Design a protein around this ligand. Structure first.
Ligand SMILES: Nc1ncnc2c1ncn2[C@@H]1O[C@H](COP(=O)(O)OP(=O)(O)O)[C@@H](O)[C@H]1O
Ligand SMILES: Oc1c(F)cc(F)cc1-c1cc[nH]n1
Ligand SMILES: [Cl-]
Ligand SMILES: [Cl-]
Ligand SMILES: [Cl-]
Ligand SMILES: [Mg+2]
Ligand SMILES: [Mg+2]
Length: 265
């Protein structure tokens, strides 16, 4: 159906391990979108064909205001193209670098929108497993949208693929290679809430080996400016035992969240 000749390519929106994303306009309809380009040679070499298929299958059927939409796909003899919803206000990662830290209002609002999207996902037993600032995009009204479902699966699960980059957002059970479920996204939610308020993840470190150690032993401390409400929520989410981590309904109903968020459930 679709082909490259149907689109006019614009400026680069960003780059990933495989994905090179461009702004694009469909010629006949003038529809503005984002074109995620992946090279087949790199996909085969890394052997992550199954990850790409999962990303397409899972994200294309999901329908939620806080989840980035996937419209379709096509390919030539060298590349695979994903037709994505265009997010005009960029990434949370960029916004965080710009402001260094978020206030309590901005943080609680983001967490609320994340919890809503994750609640929708977990209802279909879909785990994201790769929640981090660079995979969180912003809509025209500044609303948060979860993207990059390349690592997403169905619960329960083990890990078949090699961990590539940072360990900063992964729970102990994932890095130790043990079996895991939906509770891993709530660990990441705690890491995110910390980084939003502080400016850096709680287990950040100089080396892979040491970051591993701090995560497995849950070694983190709060700066003095972190309020008691934020500390309570973060401490509940960052539990070593997955079953002790709260439900998403508990997060959405937390007194600190309800007092500072500007969005409802
Ligand atoms: N729909 C989009 N709108 C705007 N920017 C995007 C969009 N999709 C991706 N990007 C940019 O491209 C980067 C990589 O996209 P992503 O799909 O996460 O690639 P990868 O899966 O290789 O990490 C993101 O960090 C973001 O900055
Ligand atoms: O060609 C593809 C496609 F059309 C859809 C999809 F999800 C994946 C692929 C793919 C993965 C490795 N080679 N090709
Ligand atoms: Cl690629
Ligand atoms: Cl498995
Ligand atoms: Cl895997
Ligand atoms: Mg990404
Ligand atoms: Mg990816």
């Amino acid at each position: 159906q679709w082909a490259l000749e149907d689109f006019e390519i614009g400026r680069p929106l960003g780059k990933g391990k495989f994905g090179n994303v461009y702004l694009a306009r469909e010629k006949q309809s003038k529809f503005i979108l984002a074109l995620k380009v992946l090279f087949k040679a790199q996909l085969e070499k890394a052997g992550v064909e199954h990850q790409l298929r999962r990303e397409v299958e899972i994200q294309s059927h999901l329908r939620h205001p806080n989840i980035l939409r996937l419209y379709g796909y096509f390919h030539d003899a060298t590349r695979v193209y994903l037709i994505l919803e265009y997010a005009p206000l960029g990434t949370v990662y960029r916004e965080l670098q710009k402001l260094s830290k978020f206030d309590e209002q901005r943080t609680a609002t983001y967490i609320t929108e994340l919890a809503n999207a994750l609640s929708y996902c977990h209802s279909k037993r879909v785990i994201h497993r790769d929640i981090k600032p660079e995979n969180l995009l912003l809509g025209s009204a500044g609303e948060l949208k979860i993207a990059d479902f390349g690592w997403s699966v169905h619960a329960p699960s083990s890990r078949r693929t090699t961990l590539a980059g940072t360990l900063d957002y992964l729970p102990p059970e994932m890095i130790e290679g043990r079996m895991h479920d939906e509770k891993v996204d709530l660990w990441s939610l705690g890491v995110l809430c910390y980084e939003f308020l502080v400016g850096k993840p709680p287990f950040e470190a100089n080396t892979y080996q040491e970051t591993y150690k701090r995560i497995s032993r849950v070694e983190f401390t709060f700066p003095d400016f972190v309020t008691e409400g934020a500390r309570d929520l973060i401490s509940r989410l960052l539990k070593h035992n997955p079953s002790q981590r709260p439900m998403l309904r508990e997060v959405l109903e937390h007194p600190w969240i309800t007092a500072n968020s500007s969005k409802p459930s």
